[PDB]
Amino acid sequence: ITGTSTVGVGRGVLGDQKNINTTYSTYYYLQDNTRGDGIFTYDAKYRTTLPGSLWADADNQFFASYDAPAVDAHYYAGVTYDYYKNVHNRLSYDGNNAAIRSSVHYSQGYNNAFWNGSEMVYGDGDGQTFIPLSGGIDVVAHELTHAVTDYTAGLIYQNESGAINEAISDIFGTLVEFYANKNPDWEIGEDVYTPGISGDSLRSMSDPAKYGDPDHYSKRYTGTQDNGGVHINSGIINKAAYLISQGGTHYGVSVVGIGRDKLGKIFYRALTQYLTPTSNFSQLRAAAVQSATDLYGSTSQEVASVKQAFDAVGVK
Numbered sequence: 001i002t003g004t005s006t007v008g009v010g011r012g013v014l015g016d017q018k019n020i021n022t023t024y025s026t027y028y029y030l031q032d033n034t035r036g037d038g039i040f041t042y043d044a045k046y047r048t049t050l051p052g053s054l055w056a057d058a059d060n061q062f063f064a065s066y067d068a069p070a071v072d073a074h075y076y077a078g079v080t081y082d083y084y085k086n087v088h089n090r091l092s093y094d095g096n097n098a099a100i101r102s103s104v105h106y107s108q109g110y111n112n113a114f115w116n117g118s119e120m121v122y123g124d125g126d127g128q129t130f131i132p133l134s135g136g137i138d139v140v141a142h143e144l145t146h147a148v149t150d151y152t153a154g155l156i157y158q159n160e161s162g163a164i165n166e167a168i169s170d171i172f173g174t175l176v177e178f179y180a181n182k183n184p185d186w187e188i189g190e191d192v193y194t195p196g197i198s199g200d201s202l203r204s205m206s207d208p209a210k211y212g213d214p215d216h217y218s219k220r221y222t223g224t225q226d227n228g229g230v231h232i233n234s235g236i237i238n239k240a241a242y243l244i245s246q247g248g249t250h251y252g253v254s255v256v257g258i259g260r261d262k263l264g265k266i267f268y269r270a271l272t273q274y275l276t277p278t279s280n281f282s283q284l285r286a287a288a289v290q291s292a293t294d295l296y297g298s299t300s301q302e303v304a305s306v307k308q309a310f311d312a313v314g315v316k
């Protein structure tokens with residue numbers, strides 16, 4: 001859409017009011033011209049055909065319940081672009097300011113969200129297991145981070161490389177949640193999962209076992225479902241990342257925490273410079289150690305905490 005940049009206001013899925021970047025050309029569109037080559041949000045109209053219609057509104061006010069998921073997908077995608085730019089100096093997911101596209105109201109009662117190799121897609125959930133998925137900033141950032149991975153390491157979505165792919169998305173979705181300071185935590189999906197149960201989440205990084213995910217390599221899932229447990233074994237890496245940042249004793253192994261910022265710097269460097277499509281857990285360990293070495297020196301405490309954290313989860 002070619003038009004005049006302006007700012008509209010709406011309410012998100014959680015009932016929170018926010019300003020969003022729109023474009024005016026007869027209607028007001030969910031097109032933010034301020035970030036890279038733009039951020040664009042589409043209405044999939046309960047169908048599965050993508051992307052759907054660029055979101056158009058008559059008055060630049062998005063307070064209807066139908067508007068909620070589009071407001072949050074549009075606004076959180078803005079925050080995520082900013083995190084990447086400001087913190088890691090990366091311009092959009094491809095590093096060359098590629099337009100970011102998202103479709104909301106995808107299918108009927110669809111309990112998931114994904115990156116399809118071209119855009120982000122969000123279901124509205126069925127109202128019980130999930131509310132519309134774009135209402136969680138860790139969710140939006142998890143999705144966008146799959147694009148990041150797609151353009152850098154390219155980790156294949158199966159087995160070990162696939163669980164690394166998922167962990168990276170959980171790690172960066174969490175870093176983005178802390179960056180926006182939106183009630184942050186080490187839980188995934190808490191804001192949009194089981195609206196009727198408080199205190200739970202989809203996955204836990206601090207304690208993956210809490211929901212039955214492995215927190216040690218010896219407890220790795222070897223089966224075939226979930227692409228070989230991409231969403232299951234990611235708990236072993238999530239726990240490792242949580243220990244590097246926060247510290248703790250796990251299975252008798254003590255880890256001094258080095259904090260979140262350094263965790264983000266070490267992981268980003270591993271992702272962009274050392275990981276490949278078929279990298280496994282042991283290779284992730286070498287990649288993380290080498291990044292911390294690059295950045296802080298072989299004799300750093302940073303390097304020391306990365307080795308302990310992997311030794312704690314039984315990776316090497």
Ligand SMILES: CC(C)C[C@H](NP(=O)(O)[C@H](Cc1ccccc1)NC(=O)OCc1ccccc1)C(=O)N[C@@H](C)C(=O)O
Nearest residue numbers: 112113114115116117133138139142143146157189202231
């Ligand atoms: C953060 C949470 C809310 C959403 C997140 N979705 P997700 O981001 O893990 C979504 C899962 C999926 C896979 C295939 C089809 C459709 C959906 N996968 C996805 O987007 O995969 C990225 C990918 C890119 C290229 C090739 C292959 C894969 C998730 O953990 N989903 C769990 C519930 C699951 O799918 O098992």
Ligand SMILES: [Ca+2]
Nearest residue numbers: 057059061062
């Ligand atoms: Ca309106």
Ligand SMILES: [Ca+2]
Nearest residue numbers: 182183184185
């Ligand atoms: Ca939170």
Ligand SMILES: [Ca+2]
Nearest residue numbers: 138187188189
């Ligand atoms: Ca969270």
Ligand SMILES: [Ca+2]
Nearest residue numbers: 193194195197
């Ligand atoms: Ca819940």
Ligand SMILES: [Zn+2]
Nearest residue numbers: 142146166169
């Ligand atoms: Zn994922």
